[PDB]
Structure 1
């Protein structure tokens, strides 16, 4: 439980870093709450939590 909780953060922060750096020049960062969620719900929670 511990190794997936603190690995839950560092996947989230880089998604919260590149997800901001991409969305600022397009300006439409009403998708930040959607482009954090839909990747983490559809792929990286099935994939990366398996390899850990």
Structure 2
């Protein structure tokens, strides 16, 4: 249990850090909450949870 919290805390801190700074240039800082959710939920939380 003590492991996956820290690597859980990490990847969200990164994925919402870098895509926004390119995305803010057009019109979208409100779709920040979507891209963090829909890539963790349907893509990484199955995969990267097992490899730890």
Give the TM-score band, short-chain normalised: 0.7 to 0.9
Structure 1 residues 18-48: Cα deviation after superposition (integer angstroms, max 9, x where no partner) = 1322311122222111011100110110011
Q: Please, which runs of 5 or more residues in structure 2 have no aligned partner?
A: none
Total equivalences in the alignment: 52
- Pick which of 23-32 and 6-15 moved more: 23-32
More helix by share: 1
**Root mean square deviation, CA, Å:** 1.1
- Poorly superposed stretches of 4+, deviation over 4 Å: none
Q: Please, which runs of 5 or more residues in structure 1 have no aligned partner?
A: none
Q: TM-score scaled by structure 2?
A: 0.86
Task: Judge conservation of contact 1:19–1:36 (CA < 8 Å) in 2.
Answer: no
